[PDB]
Design a protein around this nucleic acid. Structure first.
Length: 50
DNA sequence: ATATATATATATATATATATATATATATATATATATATATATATATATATATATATATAT
């Protein structure tokens, strides 16, 4: 999964396409707002938000 | 070992603002019908006088 891949996918279609790709592809995650993504970063790197 | 109570995200329901078409209400102008009035002539009825036909009486 790469940034160019994401840009090409987006050029094909909007958010819904990326959400479908999320189901299709393994080892990938997306979040429509920054809070859940930051929670994912926290639980991945095992560090308090500060 | 089982669902339960919670957060997240999605989808739908509800409200606001504006554009557009239609309905309701009011007022004016026009046409139709009715009513009266005017004006004229006709038609009807009644009064008086005249002339005709009919009915009744006397003589023939």
């Amino acid at each position: 999964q790469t940034l160019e891949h994401w840009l090409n996918v987006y050029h094909e279609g909007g958010t819904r396409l990326l959400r479908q790709m999320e189901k299709e592809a393994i080892g990938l995650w997306t979040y429509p707002n920054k809070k859940q993504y930051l929670a994912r970063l926290r639980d991945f790197f095992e560090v308090g938000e500060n």
